[PDB]
UniProtKB/TrEMBL annotation:
It comes from the Bacteria. Disulfide bonds join C88-C104. This is Non-hemolytic enterotoxin lytic component L1. Gene3D superfamilies: 1.20.1170.10. The lineage of its organism: Bacteria, Pseudomonadati, Pseudomonadota, Gammaproteobacteria, Vibrionales. It comes from Vibrio cholerae serotype O1 (strain ATCC 39315 / El Tor Inaba N16961).
Amino acid sequence: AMLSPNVDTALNMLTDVYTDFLGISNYDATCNSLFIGHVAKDPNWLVEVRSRTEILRAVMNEFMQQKPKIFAQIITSFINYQTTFDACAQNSKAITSTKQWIECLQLLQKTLKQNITLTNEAQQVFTKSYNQAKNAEELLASSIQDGWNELASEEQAMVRIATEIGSLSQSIASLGANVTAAQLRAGKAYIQSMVTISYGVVMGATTSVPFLSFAGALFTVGYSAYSTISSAKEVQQDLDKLTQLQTLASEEAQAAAITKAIIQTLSNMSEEFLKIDDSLPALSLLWQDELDKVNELINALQSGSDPALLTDLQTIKIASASWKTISEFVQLISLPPNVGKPVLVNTLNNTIQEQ
C-alpha cells in the first residue's frame, strides 16, 4: 500500500467513468432525437406518452447543463493531484527535513479534501436526475399500460411485436466494441456512430407509413457502424420476423407495441447510465483511501515515528510513477471521441449510411 491506488484498478474505474459519461450524453441525444408522427388522430394513450416523454427529455437536458462541469472536475482532480504529488515526490530523502515532508504532504491533504467534496457533490447531481428520470418513466409505464388495456383483444400480438423489437435492438447492440483500459492505453480508436431505427406501421393491412424514430449510439473499431450492421445476419432475421408479426395487429396496436418497447429501452438506459454505471461513489472512496493514508503518514511524522522506516515514504517515487500513468490516462479519455457516419434502419427492411 503505497501513497497510490492500484493502477490497473484506477484505470478500469476511469474507463467506467469515460463510458458512463459518454453513455449519458448519447442517452440525452437519444431523448432529444425521439420523434413520433401522427396521421391517425392521436389516441388518448399517445397524447399522454407525448407529454411524458417530453418530461424525460427535460430531465436529461437539465443534467446535461451540469455534465460538462462535472466531467471537467474529474479530469482536473487527477491532473491537480499528480502535479501536487510529483512536487512532494522529488524531495531527496537525504536533505528533506521531517518538517518539510509534513508541509508538502499537508498540501496533498488539502487537495484530497477538495477532490472528495467535489465528487460527493457531483454524485448528488446523479441521484437527483436519476430519481427524476424514474418518476418520469413511471408515468410513461402507466400511460402505455392503460393503452394496452384499451386493446386487450390484441394483447398477445402486441407482446410478440414488442419482444421482437427488443431483440432487434439487442442484435444491433451486440455488434458494439468492448471498451477497456488496455485497448485505450494501446492506442485503439473507438468510433461512435448514431444508429436510427425508423419503425413504420401498416395501415388497413395495405400501406406502410412512418410512425416513430429512435436513435442510439454504437461503438466500433476499424469498420464503420454500417459495415457491421448491414453484415449481421441476426439483424436482417429480426427485421423480417418483425414485419410478419406486425401483420397480426391493428395499426393502433402496432403503435402501442412499438411505443412500449421504446419506453422499456429508455428506462433501461437511464437505470444503466445514471445509477449502475455511475462510478462516482467508487471515485470518492479512491480519494478517501488516499486521505486516510496521507493523514496516517502526517500523524506518524508529526508524532515522532522514524521517517526512513515508514514504507509509504520509501515507495514515494513509485507511487509518483503510478500517478503519472493515471494522469496520462485521464488526458487520453479527455479527448473528443471520433464520430462516424450515422446509420438508418427502416422497418420496410433496408440499412442506409450517412443518413
